[PDB]
Each structure stands twice: as structure tokens, then as C-alpha cells.
Nucleic acid binder design. Structure first.
Lengths: 69, 153, 50, 97, 88
RNA sequence: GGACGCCCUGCGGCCGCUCAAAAGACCUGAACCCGGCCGGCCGCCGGCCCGCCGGCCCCGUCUCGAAACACGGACCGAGGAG
RNA sequence: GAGGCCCGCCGCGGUGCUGACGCGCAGAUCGCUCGUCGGAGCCGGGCAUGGGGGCGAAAGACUCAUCGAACCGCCUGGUAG
RNA sequence: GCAGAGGCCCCGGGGGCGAAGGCGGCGCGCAGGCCCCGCCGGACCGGCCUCUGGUGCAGAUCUCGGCAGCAGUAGCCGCUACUCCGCGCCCCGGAGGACUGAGGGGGAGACGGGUUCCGCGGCGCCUGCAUCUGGCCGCGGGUGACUCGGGCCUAAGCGGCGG
RNA sequence: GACCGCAGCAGGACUCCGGGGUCAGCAGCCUCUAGCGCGGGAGCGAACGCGGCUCAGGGAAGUCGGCAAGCCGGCUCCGUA
RNA sequence: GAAUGGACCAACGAGGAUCCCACUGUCCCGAGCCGCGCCUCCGCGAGCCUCCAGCCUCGGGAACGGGCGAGGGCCGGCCAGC
RNA sequence: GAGACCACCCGGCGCGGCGCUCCUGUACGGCGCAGAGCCCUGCGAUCGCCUGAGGGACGCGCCUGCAGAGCGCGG
């Protein structure tokens, strides 16, 4: 949650099959926001976790607030 | 029926513990030495074995136990001071001392230890490891201490 | 091992999430009487994939 | 009161090994409450958490014997434990000449 | 050094998981499954072991399709069959 | 699936409670083995008031012949072969 | 500056002690003492060779604590004066 | 004597007014064995006649399960080592005194293990003495790559090919 | 320090970076950095063991055999059958 | 007894012998002294074995007995050694 | 004075001082025109004197200081 405030990054678990570009289009279309970069690790427990850094113009704190995170 | 002693109107205070994590052999001896002692004398005596002033006579399981000067009087040259057992026997006696005095309203002097049954109990079985691919055991020997304070012998 | 394979990682991952105790509420609902999983493993003794 | 987690963090902040790290024993409580690199950094300004110097061995005895060796004081045949050719290669002197 | 020292120089994975049978029977060097038989199309069944055959065969899994279709044969799969034989 | 009260630094104990019963982590609960308390000085067989006299080698098994310095046998329970 | 040269560290072997241990630290370990140490050297990974077959600077050695013929199942509850 | 089967047990065999089983004590029988009494136990069980058999155990380096004496015995003899004080546990903090001694008891990787990593709480196990410790247990988290590696290409090799 | 040997198994595991002093040395011996105090402690100071020292005078007479120990050793310079 | 190779030894060799100088507890002839075990305590705690029982002399006996015949010794309970 | 443990023999013990005697071999430091020499009053391995010194002691003699004989247990 500190990352949302200083890295503009919302961390989301996404499907393992999803590629970086697919999560860019999905985050943009579902949360109506602009994304800059998605870094992705597969959790030791086999879950893809995405670190979406939102584009500078949008602030993640507002985007997180709309989701409730 | 866990308690071996049958009071049959003997006005006694009884406290026990089940599978106490001590050695059966060492605890048995502490209880036997305590038998017949005044409740106060027993408390002082058990404090003395902890302080090494007085020894616990080993009347039964004595092989490999060293003769000491303190046991000269008890009639057995052999004796040992078992510290872990002494703590348990004092704790069990304390619960009996309080329970008789609260239940039978008896002054501490009147109460004297009268019964000491200790029964070997089931114990943990940690494995030991030996030479030539052999696996041994380090089975424990817990005991069920039952100590009863009473009016008179 | 730090150079693992996703397919191997996926099978090892299931084992980590599966090695869990019976939920206490499950024990209560079914009246289990046997609260130990017996399919629970330990990294020191158990060799998965052996 | 394990101060081990605080000690590990203090080592990275100070940039030194845990052995060098020392704690002011008086402030046991304020170190126990510390739980972060930043919190330890505030303690470092208070000087309760400090590192020692590397206390490296003295070279004074060595730099005295070395100077005496320049005066030919400790060189003798008993002192030599290696062959002349090892101490002075003959190739070295010819190549220089 | 026949036993302990020799066992200490082991740090390799001779066998690996099988594609078809999900067991640590696939030799990595030979590319064959000890139990599954993969990459052979036919599976490895040997009547020398009754127990091995029993450990993996029909009935040792969901039997999803077969169960559903067997149940239908005790119901309306047979009526569908009669309709096909006659016209369609 | 354990009311209460008493204590205990506390653990835990103690009472009791529920129930027909604790049946209390479990139906019955044997043998071996062991702890208390009490009672004796003791293997068997016989006579006797009862600790004295008399008699008693360790079985099974092969074997001409076993107490054998032949072999098998710690102990007890269950299973075990025309 | 040459050498299947010598001494010697790590390594690589294992000579003695008939040492310790011998229900072991250990189904072969430990201590000194050793042989060698630019070589016909050592070490890791990949690979190939399969059972009367392999491999062997040959010891019937080695082939996963098994080898003068592996191991697992089966024929097989093989047969025995 | 055992365990079943077919019958019988003269108002339809014995049983919560206590079955089988267990523990002691009589009695009968040459004995195999039976019977009854007391106590525990808590629902089944027989006698006779005919029938059946997977029908009686001191042994088999018998099988399996329990467990004794030895015996509070043998042993816990590698890696130089701890001490004082704090509230102090072998954990921790300060102060001493050591040690591994850069072919390290250091800091890192390949492999192999597969979450052991970390933080918080605890000890019921385990830590072969202890523990307030922990690699142990419960809970919650933790692995981010255009440049590093896989992928890529070939090596020994291995497959594939009208056949 | 988590691999592999039934173990928290004086067992075995491949690399990479490698300070100071004495030294010919990456040897031995102490040290800086960094790690750290290891299946527990107390006493007593028997026999006997296990490792380690020393021993008068003699010196292998000991023993199957000088086994074991002891001697020797670095460097320079003579002198070498 | 002559490539089932004969003779021959420079240099080697953890190869197998013999002797000498040196050196030393190898020994005469053993003695003292460290550490660590042992021993005693505190806490932990097995293994293995086990017909029974654990004193001898002689006799007879599967010819070499703890037990059997005849004597002669022997409270019982333990430790450290061996 | 005795010892694995015990037992044995002795008991108001012991601790740490002081003398005596003994072991080793002349303590730190100060002093010198010592000192081979070198060089500025500096340097120097050493040597002589204070010093058969100092340091040490588990043997003796003494207390000069602290202490020291359990209403502990059993009869």
C-alpha cells in the first residue's frame, strides 16, 4: 500500500497464462486508467503477481480508492 | 479408580499427578524416604536434598548408585540426591497439604505423609542411532506420583 | 534449484499449499476424531518427487 | 529480549559487520521498540547505536624491523631460511646488468 | 568408499516426472517412462505383476465419460441407437 | 464430553457434577510385568498343623545311549501343521 | 630453460602403525606416518556401452552398501531320500 | 472340549429379578473336563439328539503384538572456551578472555532439497542436558529483468527419413 | 551449516573472491576483516586406557623381524668414494 | 637354462633379505608428570544376551557337571577393577 | 599422614599475613668518565654499582588480622 503512494504501483494477482501486454490492456479497460509498465513474478505458490506502475498523469492512490484497496 | 490408597474414613488429604515427566526410579525413592515424616519435616528434608545437606536413601533401585556419608544413618550406604524428582514430590505434597487442611480443617502439624504409591507410566520413544546401520530407542520412564498426607501413623 | 522449471515449480507449489492442517471448523462439522492430516510432509525428512 | 533483528538491520545501515556494532546498554527499551532501518537510523543520530573502529593490528613493530633491515641489522646467515637464488634470482641480476 | 562416501557423491536427477503417468519414472537420459511407457503409444502392461496393473488402469480414476455413457445405456442411449439404425 | 466451590505464584490438584454407570477418551480389560499396604520364607510330590522329615537333574528332540561341555528354548498373549 | 626429473602445499592415492574405534563419528571413519604432485596428472557437467551382456594398464576386479554372472516381478507355495 | 447346521426343551428352553466374558473360591469326574457360589461386567447364551468342520499347542534360529531382568547400567571423550553482570535461559545486551586463521567455523554461486527464507506469537512435539532458543510449532507475508541466465546455436551424441 | 548417506551421522559433496607479519613460499605458526563459543554440565584428581613429555648408566643385549620411538634436517661455505 | 627367454644392476622402488655407524625406555628395569576419559554427582538414557540356576573337590556318567552320588565351604545386599 | 566412591585418621577448622628456611640467580628503575662505534649531546647490543638482589613457595615457627565447636539430624 506504501508502493501505491511512492511507486504508483498496484500489485494484482492475475492469471498465470496472462502475458504482460494482456494485463496492460485489461487493467486499462477494467479500471479505466493508463498503465506504464507491468513487472510480473510467479508466486512460489504458482500465482502470477503483477506490479502495475500507472502512467505519471494518473495517480494510483485515486485508482486504488475506486477499487477499495 | 486411579487412587491406590483406600481411606475408608481416615480423614486424609490426597494429591496426585499422572505421567509426571521425571524418572520413575528416582521419584520412587524420594517418596519412600518421605513416608512417615512430619509434613513440616518433609518440607525441610526435601529442601535439604536440593541443597545437598541431606541425601535420599535408595532402598530399592541402588545398583550403580554411589555410597555417600549422608546415607550412613538410613541403613543403606547407597544414596543419591535426585533434584528433578524432589521438585515434583514437594509440589505434589503441597497440593495434598493444602487439600487436607482446607477439607478436613486439620492443623499442618497433625498432617503426616502416610502413603506413597508411584506407578511407572507410558513414555515417549525417541529413536537413538547406532553403528552398522542400527536404530535404537531412548524411551522415557515417567511415573504416576500419588502422595497422601494423613492424621497419624 | 534457483534455475527451476515452471512445470516443476507448479507441481512443487501445489505440495506447499496442500501441506496444511484440517481446518478446525471442518473437524467440528464432520466430527472427525482424527485431526491429523497424515498427508502433511516436512522438508527435512520427506523427499517429494523421489 | 532478542535484539538480534535490530542488530542485523544496524549492520547494513552502519555498513559494517555485526561484531563491530555496539549498543548503548542503557537504552535497552528504545532498541527493543526499534523495528526498522529508519528507526535504527534515528537511534544512530542519538549515538545509542554505534560501530567500533576496525582495530587493525599495529604495524609499528614491523616498520621498525623493516627500517633496521635497511641498516642490515636482522640479515644474517642464521636469519636466511631460503636459498640465495630464491632471495636474489641470478637471472634478475644479469637481466638488470 | 563403497557405501557412505559413494552415496555422498550423488546430486543428480536420473528419473523425472512422466508426461502421461505423472510419476518419477521418466529417465531423463533415455527419454522413456519406466512405468508409463511414454513415448510408446501403447502403455506398458505386463502380466508378471498383477499389483502393478491394479495400481493404474480403468477404475483407478474418474472414469468420467465411461460412467456417464454406461448410465445412459441403462436409459435412453439405446432408443437413440434404434432411431439412427432406422432412417436417422 | 464434565455444574460448583476450594486452594495453588501458577501448573495442576482437590472435591464433586452430568449419566444407569464414568463408560471421562473411552465396551469387556486376561496373561506377562510392576508400585503401595498387609502377610510369610519360601521349586515340586507325600505325611502331618505347616515347617520339619523323606523322595525328586531340564524340558522337547534326534539318538545304541541326554542332566549333558549336542541342538532349540528370556517371558506372556493370540495365530500355527494329514 | 629441458625433463612421463627430484623435494614439497592443496589435490589425488592409501604404506605402515597391525594405533584409535570396533553394539563405531562411520555397513570402511579418524589420527600421525606415508606414495605421488606438469605427468600415462586430477576434477565437474553432458554423453555412449546392459546382464552370460558391458567394461577391465587383468584384480574374475567393476557394473548404486550385491558380482567366478546385477536387480525387480513372475513361473514358484520349484524340488529335497 | 470347540465353532457353526437341523431338531427338541408339555402353556413352550435360560436372560437388565443381569447374557456372554474376566477374577478368586468350592463341589463332582481316573482324567480330558464340568458344575455351582461370590465379585466385576453389560446383552446375549445354551443342554440333549442328528449333522458339519478352517476343531484342542510349551517348542518349529515359529509368525505378530506386548513387555521384563540386565539398569538408573553402557554411554552423552571430535572441531582449544568460557566468564561476570543485567531480570537472564545454552536466548539477548554490555564488559572481558579465546577460537575458525583469506585451500576460513568468511562472503557468494552451479547442483540437489522445495519454502526450510522473513516477521509476529508460542513451546504440545522436536532441539539426543536444558531452553524464555531454534532451522521446531501456529499465523501472516516474501522471488519484479530489453541488457544477467534460460530461450538461441551447435559439440559429443540423439532422434527423423521414400523405405 | 537445509544436499546425500535411517540422525542435530569426528562420512562424502563442484566452483568463484582471496588481507598482515615471520618466511623461498598459497608451507607451518600467530593475526586484521568477517564469522563465532559446536548431542549438556559440576566435582574429584584411584587403577587402567587414550594421546603427550621426560628419564641416571648402558645402549637392541628386546623382538619373528630396530615394530615403535629416537637421530638427521633450513641456509651459506668447504669437502665429496 | 636360453623371447615356456638365459646371463647382466647404472638409475629407481611405501618391493623382499643381511650387516655396520649413528641414535634412542626396544630392553635391563622401570619411574615421575601432564591433558582427556574412567570414578562420584545433576539432567538424560539404550544395546546385547537370557531352560532354569549361578561355590567347590572327587566319583560315576554321550568317557571335560552348576545341578547327579559322596564330602567340604557358604547371612543377605552392592561398588571399583579384573 | 588417608582416599575411585566410601571408609580410615584427626578437628572450633580454615582463609592471608609475618618472621625462618629454601628454590632461582642479581628485579624495575636510577646512576657511570663503562661500551664497539656512529653522531652531536644525540644513538647504542650490552657491562659495573644500589643487589647472594628481587621474585616465588604447598616445609617450619607464630597471630599480629578475620574467623572458627548447628537446639541440623538421629539415638
Amino acid at each position: 500500500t506504501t508502493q501505491i503512494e511512492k511507486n504508483n504501483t498496484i500489485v494484482f494477482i492475475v492469471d498465470r497464462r496472462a502475458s504482460k501486454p494482456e494485463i496492460r490492456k485489461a487493467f486499462e479497460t477494467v479500471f479505466e486508467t493508463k498503465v506504464a509498465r507491468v513487472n510480473t513474478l510467479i508466486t512460489p505458490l504458482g500465482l502470477k503477481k503483477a506490479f502495475i506502475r500507472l502512467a505519471p498523469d494518473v495517480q494510483a492512490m485515486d485508482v486504488a480508492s475506486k477499487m477499495g484497496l | 479408580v486411579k487412587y491406590a490408597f483406600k481411606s475408608d474414613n481416615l480423614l486424609v488429604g490426597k494429591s496426585r499427578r499422572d505421567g509426571v515427566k521425571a524418572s520413575f526410579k528416582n521419584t520412587y525413592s524420594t517418596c519412600r524416604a518421605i513416608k512417615g515424616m512430619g509434613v513440616k519435616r518433609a518440607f525441610a528434608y526435601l529442601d535439604n536434598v536440593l541443597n545437598h545437606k541431606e541425601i535420599v536413601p535408595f532402598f530399592k533401585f541402588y545398583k550403580g548408585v554411589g555410597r555417600h556419608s549422608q546415607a550412613r544413618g538410613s541403613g543403606t550406604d547407597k544414596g543419591r540426591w535426585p533434584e528433578k524428582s524432589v521438585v515434583v514430590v514437594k509440589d505434589i505434597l503441597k497440593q495434598a497439604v493444602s487439600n487436607a487442611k482446607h477439607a478436613h480443617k486439620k492443623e499442618e502439624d497433625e498432617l503426616y505423609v502416610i502413603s506413597y504409591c508411584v506407578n511407572r507410566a507410558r513414555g515417549r520413544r525417541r529413536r537413538t542411532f547406532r553403528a552398522h546401520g542400527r536404530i535404537s530407542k531412548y524411551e522415557s520412564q515417567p511415573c504416576h506420583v500419588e502422595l497422601i498426607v494423613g492424621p497419624k501413623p | 534449484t534457483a534455475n527451476k522449471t515452471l512445470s516443476r515449480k507448479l507441481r512443487l507449489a501445489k505440495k506447499t499449499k496442500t501441506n496444511k492442517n484440517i481446518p478446525r471448523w471442518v473437524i467440528a462439522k464432520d466430527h472427525l476424531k482424527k485431526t491429523w492430516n497424515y498427508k502433511r510432509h516436512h522438508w527435512r525428512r520427506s523427499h517429494l518427487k523421489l | 529480549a532478542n535484539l538480534r533483528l535490530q542488530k542485523r538491520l544496524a549492520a547494513d545501515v552502519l555498513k559494517c559487520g555485526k561484531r563491530r556494532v555496539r549498543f548503548n546498554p542503557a537504552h535497552e527499551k528504545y532498541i527493543e521498540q526499534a523495528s526498522s532501518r529508519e528507526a535504527i537510523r534515528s537511534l544512530i543520530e542519538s549515538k545509542i547505536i554505534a560501530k567500533l573502529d576496525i582495530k587493525g593490528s599495529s604495524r609499528g613493530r614491523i616498520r621498525a624491523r623493516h627500517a633496521a633491515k635497511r641498516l642490515g641489522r636482522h640479515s644474517g646467515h642464521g636469519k636466511r631460511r631460503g636459498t640465495r637464488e630464491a632471495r636474489m634470482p641470478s637471472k634478475t641480476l644479469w637481466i638488470q646488468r | 568408499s563403497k557405501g557412505t562416501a559413494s552415496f555422498g557423491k550423488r546430486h543428480t536427477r536420473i528419473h523425472g516426472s512422466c508426461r502421461r503417468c505423472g510419476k518419477h519414472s521418466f529417465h531423463l537420459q533415455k527419454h522413456e517412462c519406466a512405468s508409463c511407457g511414454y513415448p510408446s503409444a501403447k502403455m506398458r502392461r505386463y502380466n508378471w505383476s498383477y499389483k502393478s496393473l491394479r495400481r493404474r488402469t480403468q477404475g483407478t480414476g474418474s472414469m468420467s465419460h465411461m460412467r456417464k455413457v454406461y448410465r445412459a445405456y441403462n436409459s435412453g442411449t439405446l432408443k437413440a441407437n434404434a432411431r439412427k439404425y432406422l432412417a436417422k
